[PDB]
Every structure is written in structure tokens, then in C-alpha cells.
Ligand binder design. Structure first.
Ligand SMILES: *[C@@H]1O[C@H](CO)[C@@H](O)[C@H](O)[C@H]1NC(C)=O
Ligand SMILES: *[C@@H]1O[C@H](CO)[C@@H](O)[C@H](O)[C@H]1NC(C)=O
Lengths: 96, 97, 49
């Protein structure tokens, strides 16, 4: 939980998140874009009715509920396959 | 009949309609109002025709402009505190036109 | 070239083959670089001299 950096007086709406996309996300694939979702059949380009901005603000304040707190999430991806590795922990080197 | 009404009640007395025994098609909702705030919290505006629900409540009330942004789970204000409070765990949508 | 889960893979084998065109005798390919691009690729183009 990170409410000491992701919150300030009078709020903070710098963060973003997408609710409107034409299709699904494939695993580990970024889709950064600002294209207004198509509603009905209109080629409408803009804000308002049946023309929605793809992403809305993820605004955070110091006073929210626990489910509404600015949680900081980082994920780690590993590749435990047969390949030359790079990262290890403690290392001894007893002779072969 | 919930969106073709002519006397949408005020926020202090919000009329609550219990919708039961019907097929919820959202195209009649899409063609009836040129929306300005169709934000959802528990479902997706796009994903509504492929989920089946037990009961549906349609609370209808005419309100000011800023109060539209006021109406949301986990909010505050003269409406969110004294007139109509949306629970933080709300599974539904709001429509403003 | 391939772009499964990123990890761009380049395979190659250089040899002065008969030289008419694509040969008929079998030849293997030895991977040279395997580098994790992790981006989206849709279109392909070649440069000249
Ligand atoms: C990659 O590009 C294709 C076509 O340009 C597009 O359909 C697809 O959604 C893109 N994927 C990502 C993860 O950007
Ligand atoms: C009410 O229904 C009529 C008949 O379909 C339609 O023309 C009209 O636009 C509707 N008005 C509202 C406010 O839903």
C-alpha cells in the first residue's frame, strides 16, 4: 500500500487506466493509445454521447477506503527454462 | 418506461424500480439517451448482453451537472451524504443525459 | 526471424552454394542472436546499398 506518495491534499488525478478496448489483451502486450470507442455505427471522433474516451482518470486521494487505496503493485517474470542464466544468489566455487 | 418517463423524481426521494422477469437488452438504452456519463464499476459498458443477473434496480432522479460526477461509490458531498449515497461495493452502472 | 513471446531469434548459415537460386540440397540453420525485443511487429521491410 502506497498512500504517502500516491496521494496529496486536493487529490491527484495523474494516473490512468483503460476501460474501452475493441478486443482483449494478449499476455504481456502493451496497447498505449488514445482512440475513442465506437458505439452504434458512428465513425464519431471525440467526446460525448456514444463517443467515449478510451481511458479514464485513476485519481487518488489520502482519504479513501481500503479497497480504494493507492496500492503499489510490481510483478516479476521468470524464465525457468534450459538456457544460460544471468542472475543468482549466494555462490561457492568448489573445484570440479 | 423508466427512460420515457416525464416526472423523474428528485434526488431526496429517489424512485426505485424493481426490474424482474424480462430480457435486458441494452440497445433500447443506447438509442434512447445521448449519454454524457455512462461509467460502470462492476461490469463493462460493452459487456452487458452476455451476463445473466438475478434482479435489477433502476433508481432514476434528475440532478445538477457536478452532482453527476458526485454520484459514484466512495464519494462525498451534499448529495452523496444526505440525498443519495452509493455503496463502495456497487455492481452496476449510472447513466446521465 | 521470429517473435514468439518477444525474444527475437535470428538464424543464419552462410555458404557459397551452387548459386543459381534457392538450392535443393538440405542445409541447416544456426541461430546467431536471441534477444528479447518484447514489442509488437506487424510489417517488414528491407534496406539496400
Ligand atoms: C499489434 O499490432 C496488431 C496490428 O497492428 C494489433 O492488431 C494488435 O492489437 C497489436 N498488439 C499489441 C499488444 O499492441
Ligand atoms: C419515447 O418513446 C417514443 C416511441 O418510441 C420515442 O420516439 C421517444 O424518443 C421516446 N422518448 C424517450 C425520452 O425515451
Amino acid at each position: 500500500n502506497s498512500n504517502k506518495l500516491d496521494s496529496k491534499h486536493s487529490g491527484n488525478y495523474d494516473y490512468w487506466y483503460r476501460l474501452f478496448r475493441k478486443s482483449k489483451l494478449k499476455p504481456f502486450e502493451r496497447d498505449i493509445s488514445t482512440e475513442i470507442y465506437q458505439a452504434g455505427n458512428k465513425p464519431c471522433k471525440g467526446k460525448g454521447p456514444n463517443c467515449y474516451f478510451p481511458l479514464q482518470s485513476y485519481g487518488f486521494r489520502p482519504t479513501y477506503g481500503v479497497g480504494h487505496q493507492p496500492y503499489r503493485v510490481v510483478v516479476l517474470s521468470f524464465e525457468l527454462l534450459h538456457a544460460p542464466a544471468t542472475v543468482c544468489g549466494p555462490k561457492k566455487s568448489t573445484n570440479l | 418506461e423508466v427512460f420515457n418517463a416525464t416526472r423523474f423524481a428528485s434526488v431526496y426521494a429517489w424512485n426505485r424500480k424493481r426490474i424482474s422477469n424480462c430480457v435486458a437488452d441494452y440497445s433500447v438504452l443506447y438509442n434512447f439517451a445521448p449519454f454524457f456519463a455512462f461509467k460502470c464499476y462492476g461490469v463493462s459498458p460493452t459487456k452487458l448482453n452476455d451476463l445473466c443477473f438475478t434482479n435489477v434496480y433502476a433508481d432514476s432522479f434528475v440532478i445538477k451537472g457536478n452532482e453527476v460526477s458526485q454520484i459514484a461509490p466512495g464519494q462525498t458531498g451534499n448529495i452523496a451524504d444526505y440525498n443519495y449515497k452509493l455503496p463502495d461495493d456497487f455492481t452496476g452502472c449510472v447513466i446521465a443525459w | 526471424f521470429k517473435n514468439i513471446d518477444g525474444y527475437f531469434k535470428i538464424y543464419s548459415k552462410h555458404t557459397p552454394i551452387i548459386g543459381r537460386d534457392f538450392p535443393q540440397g538440405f542445409s541447416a540453420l544456426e541461430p546467431l542472436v536471441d534477444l528479447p525485443i518484447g514489442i509488437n511487429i506487424t510489417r517488414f521491410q528491407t534496406l539496400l546499398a
